[PDB]
PDB file of C-alpha atoms and ligand atoms in Angstrom:
ATOM      1  CA  UNK A   2      12.181  15.481 121.053  1.00 47.22           C
ATOM      2  CA  UNK A   3      12.518  18.144 118.350  1.00 43.21           C
ATOM      3  CA  UNK A   4      15.130  18.063 115.591  1.00 42.31           C
ATOM      4  CA  UNK A   5      16.937  21.198 114.384  1.00 41.53           C
ATOM      5  CA  UNK A   6      19.640  20.118 111.955  1.00 43.19           C
ATOM      6  CA  UNK A   7      22.069  17.785 113.735  1.00 41.41           C
ATOM      7  CA  UNK A   8      20.867  18.852 117.203  1.00 43.14           C
ATOM      8  CA  UNK A   9      17.994  17.870 119.450  1.00 48.60           C
ATOM      9  CA  UNK A  10      15.903  20.851 120.541  1.00 44.80           C
ATOM     10  CA  UNK A  11      14.550  20.769 124.073  1.00 43.31           C
ATOM     11  CA  UNK A  12      10.738  21.065 123.982  1.00 43.16           C
ATOM     12  CA  UNK A  13      10.867  23.899 126.517  1.00 47.27           C
ATOM     13  CA  UNK A  14      12.163  26.274 123.831  1.00 46.60           C
ATOM     14  CA  UNK A  15       9.345  25.493 121.367  1.00 46.43           C
ATOM     15  CA  UNK A  16       6.159  27.568 121.569  1.00 44.15           C
ATOM     16  CA  UNK A  17       4.228  26.333 118.500  1.00 48.67           C
ATOM     17  CA  UNK A  18       3.922  23.028 116.629  1.00 46.02           C
ATOM     18  CA  UNK A  19       1.707  22.545 113.567  1.00 46.52           C
ATOM     19  CA  UNK A  20       1.138  19.500 111.358  1.00 47.16           C
ATOM     20  CA  UNK A  21       4.369  20.272 109.461  1.00 41.88           C
ATOM     21  CA  UNK A  22       6.138  23.223 111.146  1.00 37.14           C
ATOM     22  CA  UNK A  23       7.274  24.533 114.523  1.00 39.04           C
ATOM     23  CA  UNK A  24       8.594  27.758 116.040  1.00 41.55           C
ATOM     24  CA  UNK A  25      11.265  28.111 118.719  1.00 42.76           C
ATOM     25  CA  UNK A  26      13.033  30.847 120.646  1.00 42.60           C
ATOM     26  CA  UNK A  27      16.631  31.768 119.934  1.00 46.18           C
ATOM     27  CA  UNK A  28      19.690  31.016 122.037  1.00 44.53           C
ATOM     28  CA  UNK A  29      21.394  34.205 120.743  1.00 43.67           C
ATOM     29  CA  UNK A  30      18.702  36.621 119.527  1.00 41.97           C
ATOM     30  CA  UNK A  31      19.659  39.657 117.468  1.00 40.78           C
ATOM     31  CA  UNK A  32      16.795  41.621 119.035  1.00 40.55           C
ATOM     32  CA  UNK A  33      14.201  40.782 121.694  1.00 41.30           C
ATOM     33  CA  UNK A  34      11.598  38.451 120.247  1.00 37.69           C
ATOM     34  CA  UNK A  35      13.897  37.122 117.518  1.00 40.23           C
ATOM     35  CA  UNK A  36      12.325  33.699 116.902  1.00 39.83           C
ATOM     36  CA  UNK A  37      12.625  30.920 114.318  1.00 40.18           C
ATOM     37  CA  UNK A  38       9.989  29.000 112.343  1.00 40.34           C
ATOM     38  CA  UNK A  39      10.988  25.719 110.703  1.00 37.96           C
ATOM     39  CA  UNK A  40       9.563  22.652 108.989  1.00 35.87           C
ATOM     40  CA  UNK A  41       9.361  19.649 111.277  1.00 37.92           C
ATOM     41  CA  UNK A  42      11.200  17.732 108.537  1.00 40.24           C
ATOM     42  CA  UNK A  43      14.945  18.504 108.535  1.00 40.82           C
ATOM     43  CA  UNK A  44      15.668  19.599 104.960  1.00 41.05           C
ATOM     44  CA  UNK A  45      18.641  21.852 104.242  1.00 40.90           C
ATOM     45  CA  UNK A  46      17.371  23.942 101.329  1.00 38.36           C
ATOM     46  CA  UNK A  47      14.099  25.786 100.830  1.00 37.24           C
ATOM     47  CA  UNK A  48      13.616  24.117  97.436  1.00 36.55           C
ATOM     48  CA  UNK A  49      13.555  20.729  99.207  1.00 34.68           C
ATOM     49  CA  UNK A  50      10.127  21.476 100.722  1.00 36.26           C
ATOM     50  CA  UNK A  51       6.874  20.086  99.365  1.00 38.31           C
ATOM     51  CA  UNK A  52       4.115  22.600  98.533  1.00 38.04           C
ATOM     52  CA  UNK A  53       2.024  21.923 101.666  1.00 37.05           C
ATOM     53  CA  UNK A  54       5.160  22.341 103.790  1.00 36.43           C
ATOM     54  CA  UNK A  55       5.823  25.699 102.115  1.00 31.65           C
ATOM     55  CA  UNK A  56       2.266  26.824 102.817  1.00 28.70           C
ATOM     56  CA  UNK A  57       2.368  25.610 106.420  1.00 29.00           C
ATOM     57  CA  UNK A  58       5.846  27.044 107.017  1.00 29.24           C
ATOM     58  CA  UNK A  59       4.781  30.584 106.106  1.00 34.89           C
ATOM     59  CA  UNK A  60       1.195  30.543 107.318  1.00 35.06           C
ATOM     60  CA  UNK A  61       2.797  29.606 110.630  1.00 34.23           C
ATOM     61  CA  UNK A  62       5.415  32.329 110.103  1.00 33.90           C
ATOM     62  CA  UNK A  63       2.602  34.837 109.541  1.00 37.91           C
ATOM     63  CA  UNK A  64       0.895  33.968 112.828  1.00 41.15           C
ATOM     64  CA  UNK A  65       4.173  33.922 114.755  1.00 40.52           C
ATOM     65  CA  UNK A  66       5.183  37.345 113.474  1.00 36.74           C
ATOM     66  CA  UNK A  67       1.962  39.017 114.589  1.00 38.19           C
ATOM     67  CA  UNK A  68       2.320  37.470 118.053  1.00 39.69           C
ATOM     68  CA  UNK A  69       5.947  38.468 118.567  1.00 42.04           C
ATOM     69  CA  UNK A  70       5.215  41.923 117.135  1.00 41.75           C
ATOM     70  CA  UNK A  71       2.627  42.535 119.868  1.00 39.25           C
ATOM     71  CA  UNK A  72       4.385  40.746 122.726  1.00 36.90           C
ATOM     72  CA  UNK A  73       7.659  42.657 122.248  1.00 37.64           C
ATOM     73  CA  UNK A  74       5.888  45.917 121.323  1.00 36.16           C
ATOM     74  CA  UNK A  75       7.141  46.099 117.782  1.00 34.84           C
ATOM     75  CA  UNK A  76       5.603  48.170 115.023  1.00 36.13           C
ATOM     76  CA  UNK A  77       7.079  46.190 112.112  1.00 36.33           C
ATOM     77  CA  UNK A  78       8.654  42.817 111.383  1.00 37.33           C
ATOM     78  CA  UNK A  79      11.705  41.564 109.515  1.00 37.71           C
ATOM     79  CA  UNK A  80      11.335  38.114 107.944  1.00 36.59           C
ATOM     80  CA  UNK A  81      14.507  36.523 106.591  1.00 38.05           C
ATOM     81  CA  UNK A  82      15.575  33.086 105.366  1.00 36.51           C
ATOM     82  CA  UNK A  83      19.271  32.326 104.785  1.00 37.98           C
ATOM     83  CA  UNK A  84      18.751  29.575 102.202  1.00 38.10           C
ATOM     84  CA  UNK A  85      22.101  27.897 101.799  1.00 38.66           C
ATOM     85  CA  UNK A  86      25.751  28.073 102.815  1.00 43.48           C
ATOM     86  CA  UNK A  87      26.666  31.207 100.820  1.00 38.41           C
ATOM     87  CA  UNK A  88      23.721  33.131 102.328  1.00 38.80           C
ATOM     88  CA  UNK A  89      24.846  32.576 105.942  1.00 38.53           C
ATOM     89  CA  UNK A  90      23.135  29.315 106.920  1.00 36.04           C
ATOM     90  CA  UNK A  91      24.812  27.679 109.920  1.00 35.67           C
ATOM     91  CA  UNK A  92      22.286  24.974 110.833  1.00 34.48           C
ATOM     92  CA  UNK A  93      21.437  22.706 107.886  1.00 36.95           C
ATOM     93  CA  UNK A  94      17.672  23.005 108.407  1.00 38.21           C
ATOM     94  CA  UNK A  95      15.303  25.443 106.723  1.00 37.78           C
ATOM     95  CA  UNK A  96      14.440  28.170 109.209  1.00 37.94           C
ATOM     96  CA  UNK A  97      12.700  31.534 108.944  1.00 35.19           C
ATOM     97  CA  UNK A  98      13.924  34.416 111.093  1.00 35.48           C
ATOM     98  CA  UNK A  99      11.175  36.574 112.607  1.00 37.60           C
ATOM     99  CA  UNK A 100      12.331  39.783 114.292  1.00 37.60           C
ATOM    100  CA  UNK A 101      10.137  42.457 115.928  1.00 35.83           C
ATOM    101  CA  UNK A 102      11.304  45.925 114.938  1.00 35.53           C
ATOM    102  CA  UNK A 103      10.967  49.216 116.809  1.00 38.19           C
ATOM    103  CA  UNK A 104      11.819  52.747 115.687  1.00 39.00           C
ATOM    104  CA  UNK A 105      15.504  53.329 116.288  1.00 40.17           C
ATOM    105  CA  UNK A 106      16.546  49.782 117.161  1.00 40.16           C
ATOM    106  CA  UNK A 107      19.228  49.931 114.442  1.00 41.30           C
ATOM    107  CA  UNK A 108      20.173  53.433 113.300  1.00 40.83           C
ATOM    108  CA  UNK A 109      20.661  51.771 109.882  1.00 42.25           C
ATOM    109  CA  UNK A 110      17.859  49.379 108.929  1.00 40.83           C
ATOM    110  CA  UNK A 111      20.288  47.488 106.628  1.00 42.31           C
ATOM    111  CA  UNK A 112      22.630  46.510 109.492  1.00 44.45           C
ATOM    112  CA  UNK A 113      20.246  43.812 110.784  1.00 45.22           C
ATOM    113  CA  UNK A 114      21.367  41.492 107.958  1.00 42.86           C
ATOM    114  CA  UNK A 115      24.997  41.788 108.964  1.00 39.01           C
ATOM    115  CA  UNK A 116      23.810  40.654 112.406  1.00 39.53           C
ATOM    116  CA  UNK A 117      21.785  37.729 111.041  1.00 38.82           C
ATOM    117  CA  UNK A 118      24.624  36.482 108.820  1.00 39.94           C
ATOM    118  CA  UNK A 119      26.817  36.287 111.958  1.00 37.05           C
ATOM    119  CA  UNK A 120      24.496  33.842 113.702  1.00 34.58           C
ATOM    120  CA  UNK A 128      27.494  34.056 125.203  1.00 33.87           C
ATOM    121  CA  UNK A 129      24.207  32.164 125.182  1.00 33.45           C
ATOM    122  CA  UNK A 130      20.951  32.683 127.014  1.00 32.05           C
ATOM    123  CA  UNK A 131      20.077  30.405 129.896  1.00 31.58           C
ATOM    124  CA  UNK A 132      17.757  27.423 129.622  1.00 27.88           C
ATOM    125  CA  UNK A 133      15.395  29.020 132.141  1.00 28.99           C
ATOM    126  CA  UNK A 134      15.347  32.345 130.286  1.00 27.44           C
ATOM    127  CA  UNK A 135      14.573  30.591 126.995  1.00 25.89           C
ATOM    128  CA  UNK A 136      11.884  28.332 128.486  1.00 28.22           C
ATOM    129  CA  UNK A 137      10.310  31.358 130.185  1.00 26.67           C
ATOM    130  CA  UNK A 138      10.074  33.206 126.858  1.00 30.75           C
ATOM    131  CA  UNK A 139       8.661  30.211 124.975  1.00 32.81           C
ATOM    132  CA  UNK A 140       6.146  29.455 127.742  1.00 32.80           C
ATOM    133  CA  UNK A 141       4.887  33.042 127.529  1.00 34.38           C
ATOM    134  CA  UNK A 142       4.475  32.872 123.749  1.00 35.53           C
ATOM    135  CA  UNK A 143       2.586  29.564 124.015  1.00 36.23           C
ATOM    136  CA  UNK A 144      -0.295  31.461 125.633  1.00 32.82           C
ATOM    137  CA  UNK A 145      -1.084  33.191 122.323  1.00 31.40           C
ATOM    138  CA  UNK A 146      -1.818  29.892 120.524  1.00 32.94           C
ATOM    139  CA  UNK A 147      -4.412  28.799 123.144  1.00 34.61           C
TER     140      UNK A 147
ATOM    141  CA  UNK B   2      -0.253  47.011  83.854  1.00 37.48           C
ATOM    142  CA  UNK B   3       0.530  45.414  87.224  1.00 37.28           C
ATOM    143  CA  UNK B   4       0.214  47.273  90.509  1.00 38.36           C
ATOM    144  CA  UNK B   5       3.108  47.509  92.987  1.00 35.49           C
ATOM    145  CA  UNK B   6       2.290  50.016  95.712  1.00 39.69           C
ATOM    146  CA  UNK B   7       1.544  53.280  93.943  1.00 39.41           C
ATOM    147  CA  UNK B   8       3.547  52.243  90.865  1.00 39.06           C
ATOM    148  CA  UNK B   9       2.143  50.730  87.675  1.00 37.83           C
ATOM    149  CA  UNK B  10       4.549  48.015  86.547  1.00 40.50           C
ATOM    150  CA  UNK B  11       4.873  47.495  82.812  1.00 37.47           C
ATOM    151  CA  UNK B  12       4.148  43.867  81.820  1.00 36.78           C
ATOM    152  CA  UNK B  13       7.496  43.821  79.999  1.00 33.30           C
ATOM    153  CA  UNK B  14       9.369  43.680  83.340  1.00 32.80           C
ATOM    154  CA  UNK B  15       7.116  40.986  84.883  1.00 33.70           C
ATOM    155  CA  UNK B  16       8.220  37.390  84.335  1.00 31.83           C
ATOM    156  CA  UNK B  17       5.724  35.381  86.387  1.00 34.63           C
ATOM    157  CA  UNK B  18       2.047  35.661  87.227  1.00 34.41           C
ATOM    158  CA  UNK B  19       0.064  33.147  89.250  1.00 36.84           C
ATOM    159  CA  UNK B  20      -3.601  33.309  90.220  1.00 35.28           C
ATOM    160  CA  UNK B  21      -2.686  35.336  93.323  1.00 35.41           C
ATOM    161  CA  UNK B  22       0.951  36.467  92.929  1.00 36.39           C
ATOM    162  CA  UNK B  23       3.373  37.936  90.410  1.00 37.34           C
ATOM    163  CA  UNK B  24       7.124  38.443  90.153  1.00 37.33           C
ATOM    164  CA  UNK B  25       9.000  41.397  88.692  1.00 38.31           C
ATOM    165  CA  UNK B  26      12.579  42.437  88.108  1.00 33.14           C
ATOM    166  CA  UNK B  27      14.223  45.124  90.223  1.00 33.49           C
ATOM    167  CA  UNK B  28      15.072  48.603  88.966  1.00 31.74           C
ATOM    168  CA  UNK B  29      17.815  48.883  91.637  1.00 33.22           C
ATOM    169  CA  UNK B  30      19.156  45.386  92.235  1.00 35.89           C
ATOM    170  CA  UNK B  31      21.418  44.830  95.222  1.00 38.07           C
ATOM    171  CA  UNK B  32      23.041  41.857  93.443  1.00 38.26           C
ATOM    172  CA  UNK B  33      22.507  40.364  89.983  1.00 38.55           C
ATOM    173  CA  UNK B  34      19.188  38.557  89.955  1.00 37.58           C
ATOM    174  CA  UNK B  35      17.687  40.450  92.891  1.00 35.71           C
ATOM    175  CA  UNK B  36      13.973  40.050  92.113  1.00 41.20           C
ATOM    176  CA  UNK B  37      10.685  40.771  93.907  1.00 39.98           C
ATOM    177  CA  UNK B  38       7.653  38.550  94.539  1.00 42.06           C
ATOM    178  CA  UNK B  39       4.346  40.144  95.484  1.00 42.43           C
ATOM    179  CA  UNK B  40       0.651  39.444  95.953  1.00 44.79           C
ATOM    180  CA  UNK B  41      -1.502  40.810  93.155  1.00 45.57           C
ATOM    181  CA  UNK B  42      -3.608  42.419  95.890  1.00 45.09           C
ATOM    182  CA  UNK B  43      -1.835  45.535  97.209  1.00 41.08           C
ATOM    183  CA  UNK B  44      -1.790  44.972 100.971  1.00 38.90           C
ATOM    184  CA  UNK B  45       0.779  46.844 103.014  1.00 40.63           C
ATOM    185  CA  UNK B  46       1.429  44.374 105.848  1.00 41.53           C
ATOM    186  CA  UNK B  47       2.102  40.639 105.715  1.00 43.25           C
ATOM    187  CA  UNK B  48      -0.598  39.834 108.284  1.00 41.90           C
ATOM    188  CA  UNK B  49      -3.274  41.322 105.971  1.00 37.68           C
ATOM    189  CA  UNK B  50      -2.892  38.454 103.481  1.00 34.88           C
ATOM    190  CA  UNK B  51      -5.378  35.593 103.491  1.00 36.49           C
ATOM    191  CA  UNK B  52      -4.019  32.050 103.946  1.00 34.78           C
ATOM    192  CA  UNK B  53      -4.473  31.097 100.284  1.00 33.38           C
ATOM    193  CA  UNK B  54      -2.507  34.244  99.404  1.00 30.51           C
ATOM    194  CA  UNK B  55       0.292  33.394 101.854  1.00 27.74           C
ATOM    195  CA  UNK B  56       0.645  29.903 100.377  1.00 27.12           C
ATOM    196  CA  UNK B  57       0.572  31.088  96.756  1.00 32.08           C
ATOM    197  CA  UNK B  58       2.980  33.932  97.530  1.00 32.91           C
ATOM    198  CA  UNK B  59       5.650  31.612  98.932  1.00 33.95           C
ATOM    199  CA  UNK B  60       5.148  28.615  96.670  1.00 32.18           C
ATOM    200  CA  UNK B  61       5.809  31.176  93.934  1.00 33.96           C
ATOM    201  CA  UNK B  62       8.805  32.504  95.875  1.00 33.29           C
ATOM    202  CA  UNK B  63      10.220  28.970  95.956  1.00 30.70           C
ATOM    203  CA  UNK B  64       9.778  28.639  92.186  1.00 31.82           C
ATOM    204  CA  UNK B  65      11.232  32.089  91.525  1.00 31.21           C
ATOM    205  CA  UNK B  66      14.183  31.494  93.833  1.00 32.43           C
ATOM    206  CA  UNK B  67      15.089  28.232  92.118  1.00 35.13           C
ATOM    207  CA  UNK B  68      15.116  30.011  88.747  1.00 33.49           C
ATOM    208  CA  UNK B  69      17.244  33.017  89.680  1.00 34.76           C
ATOM    209  CA  UNK B  70      19.775  30.759  91.406  1.00 36.48           C
ATOM    210  CA  UNK B  71      20.220  28.829  88.154  1.00 42.10           C
ATOM    211  CA  UNK B  72      20.211  31.765  85.751  1.00 43.50           C
ATOM    212  CA  UNK B  73      22.549  33.980  87.797  1.00 43.01           C
ATOM    213  CA  UNK B  74      24.744  31.002  88.744  1.00 42.55           C
ATOM    214  CA  UNK B  75      24.185  31.298  92.461  1.00 42.38           C
ATOM    215  CA  UNK B  76      24.875  28.600  95.051  1.00 40.95           C
ATOM    216  CA  UNK B  77      22.489  29.895  97.749  1.00 41.25           C
ATOM    217  CA  UNK B  78      19.576  32.303  98.125  1.00 42.86           C
ATOM    218  CA  UNK B  79      18.585  35.102 100.495  1.00 42.13           C
ATOM    219  CA  UNK B  80      14.849  35.596 101.036  1.00 45.37           C
ATOM    220  CA  UNK B  81      13.838  38.751 102.871  1.00 45.04           C
ATOM    221  CA  UNK B  82      10.616  40.622 103.634  1.00 47.19           C
ATOM    222  CA  UNK B  83      10.665  44.124 105.154  1.00 46.65           C
ATOM    223  CA  UNK B  84       7.200  43.987 106.709  1.00 43.48           C
ATOM    224  CA  UNK B  85       6.525  47.555 107.765  1.00 46.03           C
ATOM    225  CA  UNK B  86       8.190  50.973 107.953  1.00 44.77           C
ATOM    226  CA  UNK B  87      10.426  50.269 110.939  1.00 42.38           C
ATOM    227  CA  UNK B  88      11.748  47.245 109.019  1.00 42.33           C
ATOM    228  CA  UNK B  89      12.843  49.324 106.018  1.00 44.07           C
ATOM    229  CA  UNK B  90       9.793  49.158 103.764  1.00 44.72           C
ATOM    230  CA  UNK B  91       9.977  51.691 100.932  1.00 46.19           C
ATOM    231  CA  UNK B  92       7.024  50.434  98.861  1.00 46.71           C
ATOM    232  CA  UNK B  93       3.783  49.982 100.861  1.00 45.49           C
ATOM    233  CA  UNK B  94       3.061  46.552  99.393  1.00 44.43           C
ATOM    234  CA  UNK B  95       4.091  43.110 100.636  1.00 43.01           C
ATOM    235  CA  UNK B  96       7.038  41.878  98.595  1.00 43.09           C
ATOM    236  CA  UNK B  97       9.615  39.129  99.090  1.00 41.49           C
ATOM    237  CA  UNK B  98      13.186  39.961  98.138  1.00 41.34           C
ATOM    238  CA  UNK B  99      14.827  37.011  96.374  1.00 41.13           C
ATOM    239  CA  UNK B 100      18.577  37.279  95.864  1.00 39.21           C
ATOM    240  CA  UNK B 101      21.009  34.841  94.238  1.00 36.83           C
ATOM    241  CA  UNK B 102      24.126  34.516  96.391  1.00 34.85           C
ATOM    242  CA  UNK B 103      27.705  33.669  95.419  1.00 31.08           C
ATOM    243  CA  UNK B 104      30.810  33.008  97.485  1.00 34.12           C
ATOM    244  CA  UNK B 105      32.372  36.379  98.219  1.00 32.33           C
ATOM    245  CA  UNK B 106      29.582  38.602  96.911  1.00 30.80           C
ATOM    246  CA  UNK B 107      29.606  40.760 100.062  1.00 30.58           C
ATOM    247  CA  UNK B 108      32.398  39.552 102.425  1.00 31.66           C
ATOM    248  CA  UNK B 128      21.710  54.773  89.845  1.00 30.21           C
ATOM    249  CA  UNK B 129      18.853  52.941  88.201  1.00 25.47           C
ATOM    250  CA  UNK B 130      18.546  50.391  85.467  1.00 26.04           C
ATOM    251  CA  UNK B 131      17.137  51.120  82.032  1.00 28.87           C
ATOM    252  CA  UNK B 132      13.804  49.732  80.907  1.00 32.46           C
ATOM    253  CA  UNK B 133      15.416  47.614  78.184  1.00 34.48           C
ATOM    254  CA  UNK B 134      18.030  46.102  80.497  1.00 34.20           C
ATOM    255  CA  UNK B 135      15.151  45.200  82.826  1.00 34.14           C
ATOM    256  CA  UNK B 136      12.947  43.989  79.964  1.00 33.53           C
ATOM    257  CA  UNK B 137      15.872  41.868  78.785  1.00 32.43           C
ATOM    258  CA  UNK B 138      16.237  40.216  82.199  1.00 29.48           C
ATOM    259  CA  UNK B 139      12.494  39.588  82.502  1.00 27.48           C
ATOM    260  CA  UNK B 140      12.480  38.018  79.040  1.00 26.93           C
ATOM    261  CA  UNK B 141      15.286  35.673  80.088  1.00 28.13           C
ATOM    262  CA  UNK B 142      13.597  34.557  83.312  1.00 28.92           C
ATOM    263  CA  UNK B 143      10.243  33.954  81.619  1.00 28.70           C
ATOM    264  CA  UNK B 144      11.860  31.182  79.581  1.00 35.38           C
ATOM    265  CA  UNK B 145      12.357  29.208  82.785  1.00 33.82           C
ATOM    266  CA  UNK B 146       8.599  29.049  83.413  1.00 33.73           C
ATOM    267  CA  UNK B 147       7.868  27.884  79.859  1.00 34.80           C
ATOM    268  CA  UNK B 148       8.766  24.278  80.691  1.00 36.77           C
TER     269      UNK B 148
HETATM  270  C1  6BI C 201      20.122  22.760 121.579  1.00 37.34           C
HETATM  271  C2  6BI C 201      19.363  24.035 121.255  1.00 37.34           C
HETATM  272  N1  6BI C 201      19.871  24.673 120.052  1.00 37.34           N
HETATM  273  C3  6BI C 201      19.426  25.859 119.602  1.00 37.34           C
HETATM  274  N2  6BI C 201      18.388  26.441 120.227  1.00 37.34           N
HETATM  275  C4  6BI C 201      17.972  27.632 119.784  1.00 37.34           C
HETATM  276  N3  6BI C 201      18.446  28.366 118.774  1.00 37.34           N
HETATM  277  C5  6BI C 201      19.473  27.758 118.168  1.00 37.34           C
HETATM  278  C6  6BI C 201      20.013  26.527 118.511  1.00 37.34           C
HETATM  279  N4  6BI C 201      21.066  26.214 117.664  1.00 37.34           N
HETATM  280  C7  6BI C 201      21.138  27.236 116.852  1.00 37.34           C
HETATM  281  N5  6BI C 201      20.201  28.210 117.102  1.00 37.34           N
HETATM  282  C8  6BI C 201      20.028  29.466 116.371  1.00 37.34           C
HETATM  283  O1  6BI C 201      19.394  29.182 115.139  1.00 37.34           O
HETATM  284  C9  6BI C 201      19.850  30.106 114.122  1.00 37.34           C
HETATM  285  C10 6BI C 201      20.315  29.342 112.905  1.00 37.34           C
HETATM  286  O2  6BI C 201      19.919  30.054 111.709  1.00 37.34           O
HETATM  287  P1  6BI C 201      20.742  30.259 110.330  1.00 37.34           P
HETATM  288  O3  6BI C 201      21.199  28.878 109.856  1.00 37.34           O
HETATM  289  O4  6BI C 201      22.052  31.068 110.734  1.00 37.34           O
HETATM  290  O5  6BI C 201      19.964  31.010 109.319  1.00 37.34           O
HETATM  291  C11 6BI C 201      20.909  30.992 114.786  1.00 37.34           C
HETATM  292  O6  6BI C 201      20.373  32.267 115.130  1.00 37.34           O
HETATM  293  C12 6BI C 201      21.333  30.173 116.012  1.00 37.34           C
HETATM  294  O7  6BI C 201      21.778  30.993 117.089  1.00 37.34           O
HETATM  295 NA1   NA C 202       7.838  46.318 100.541  1.00 38.93          NA
END
């Protein structure tokens, strides 16, 4: 029922839906709690978004980061958007990466962008369990 | 004089100011056109920003990203925010990293005038 690029996202992996955005759990997370926030409209490039979509996309991203930071016991967050083919985008749909960070997770803080640019899978039940847990934070 | 963490930024290196945000050039760019977008209010963590500040900050980031992609002849952009110490934050102030990207780009400070030159160039793009 949800669109992510050329693929249909199962609802079970989505834990937030706004008027214009939505957040989903990752099939291959770089760290625990690595989630994605996207516009509901499938546009490839960040510059394709209207102003209200930009506001919604990142107000949502703000709320999602604070939730995943607490749930996965992080003390900081990495936000990253790979806006276009030459920045690592695989799925042709604007998406914001939200990663909880803990002291010592990467000995080098700058090696989490190597891992993001290289975007074996988690199970449907494992992903739906994680999303269902995160849903509790938004009521 | 603009405030970025504990640093006072000279206006000469700032190329955009909105009602709630401002953009400045980098003293230590990772690639050509690596710029920074910040709230005018010095808050350390992203969650401390009000909603109107979040919107303004990233509507600006969209504008700034479109400009640096053109000027530095990029074909994509990397947006990145190191929100907190365990995410790499050096300056205790929310800032979005905006980087023009080129095919094959990946696979010790700048001078004031070199930075003031770059800021002067980017300002022209917001003159319409
Ligand atoms: C049917 C269900 N499909 C999916 N369900 C959940 N996560 C998915 C996914 N397909 C791709 N992703 C992840 O989404 C990011 C793309 O991001 P980027 O283009 O590399 O910046 C990457 O981490 C991908 O692993
Ligand atoms: Na910072």
